[PDB]
Amino acid sequence: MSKARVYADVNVLRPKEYWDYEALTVQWGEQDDYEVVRKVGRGKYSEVFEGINVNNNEKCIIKILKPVKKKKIKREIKILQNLCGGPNIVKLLDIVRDQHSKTPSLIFEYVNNTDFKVLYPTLTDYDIRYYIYELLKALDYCHSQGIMHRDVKPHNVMIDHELRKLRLIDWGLAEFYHPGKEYNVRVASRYFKGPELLVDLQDYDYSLDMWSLGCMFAGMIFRKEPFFYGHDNHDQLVKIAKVLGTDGLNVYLNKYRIELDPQLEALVGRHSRKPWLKFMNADNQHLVSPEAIDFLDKLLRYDHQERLTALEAMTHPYFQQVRAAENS
Amino acid sequence: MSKARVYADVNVLRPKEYWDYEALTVQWGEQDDYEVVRKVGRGKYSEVFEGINVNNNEKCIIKILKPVKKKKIKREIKILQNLCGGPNIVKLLDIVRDQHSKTPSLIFEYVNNTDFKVLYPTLTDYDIRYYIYELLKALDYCHSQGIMHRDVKPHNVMIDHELRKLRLIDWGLAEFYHPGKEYNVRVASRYFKGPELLVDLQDYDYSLDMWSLGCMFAGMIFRKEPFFYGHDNHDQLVKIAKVLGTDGLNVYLNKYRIELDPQLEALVGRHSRKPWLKFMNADNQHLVSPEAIDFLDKLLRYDHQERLTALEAMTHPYFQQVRAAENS
């Protein structure tokens, strides 16, 4: 019983090839153009190496896509080309195959980054406000472009703290939003799946990303990643219930005529909502603020319809300070 | 029905506390002795960071053990203490709990390393022979000490090609060998599990590591990692079959009175053995040598009994050159 409440048409109006990505025809650049230097990461569907551009001598990231449907690559690629240039959007610099093994790679722009787990603590109330305001420009942009990043969580956002620069990455789960489409709920990453994916409400929208931002931000101010720690999809919803309280999970469910598999019903059970302040500990107190709370609270709603839009959130009292600093 | 054919009764002769690791009592050193700097790896059971010793100012590796039975920690701890000093054995430098959470972290010696995927290509026929000979001193040592590393594969061997130095790491799967004990076959890593784990022959021995050394090597000289690429344990055996051929898988099975679950029988099927030369391609030809083949061949046998000992392999014509360079 959903449709997007912002940018619902971003693909309707656009030429079909804009979102008809299987129709894409990859225009391969020059492998020889790059050399690899060190492995740096290795995701479910990819392997990441830091490489280099022999021509211009610039550092770069080589993502070598592991075995997956060609159509699931033309997606990444298209989405990426569609976003390129977007504020805080990771930048695809060239895509390369390989004369022999026929093996596509995505060669991105390099970001020097510090794993959140070591970086975040380091941050100051301000620092956070800033990076989320930055992270926000990325989501609002891309949503505006008809796209859903569908897998927001620290590890997919690079921060060059030395340059207060930020990039949103892994558009391997991003997908085009089309009003009323029934999408797949096996997306995002456990911890950061929104209720809709956990109760099977398939015609979801950009809203999903808001909830991820929700968890991501919630955990940063409270210093408790993952905020909602499910051991399993069902558990996740549960762990979410014990915080937002079941009396809302229900109202939600009826609104969208959704039905909990019994059992999931069971496991969840009856739970009252836990108000945000019961997470303000001594160690985290400097980040928690009446605003951080309003803003978090307006991200974390069972109902994706009632979450803030990216745009909307970029105006929340939390960001006033930061938003000042750009104007100057 | 198996027993080790080398080093079987060593843990028999040694004082019970030598292998009776649950009996260990961790003597924690001082955390504040170290500071964390960059994450650098994240395994199933651990998270790896490069840190530093503030007293001596030496780089070090901090392995932070994720949630697991205390006894499965006293194991590695003990195993590591037992090996410490062993040739090419990663060296535990200090172990640590944490003030509250109460999570243990192992602080190892540092190795500057280059992911095999990036490094190996780079090696020369001799480079390989050397590194394997080095990798062998590790395995022969540790076997001789009653231990099975049960996880041999590239990612667990650190190479500082700059100093031709080598360390075998992660002993989270290594276990003490006791004659006739029925162990667990959910070990090693798919690609490198030997037949015995794939047909449930639980009383296995050091021999297991030999097969992993087998795959690891095979893949290095042929340039085809993983050599045997199973998508699943069943599939793994299958993929093995299609190379060593089923006429041997059977002689093996009967010898140890082992019975394939039907189905696995099915999936495997009838297959002839593919002779090692059928993997000598043009690029890889410089590393493939009558010896490299004999050696490989004597590592990869269905019958663990018939595999080379570590020691025995450290004398194989492949290593003659290296072995020379040694006592020189």
Binding site: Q31, Y34, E35, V36 | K117, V118
Partner: peptide, 16 residues
């Protein structure tokens, strides 16, 4: 030849 990974050659550490 320039040893190569998947498809790109590999930069170098140095030695002079």
């Amino acid at each position: 030849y320039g040893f190569k990974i998947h498809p790109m050659a590999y930069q170098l550490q140095l030695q002079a």
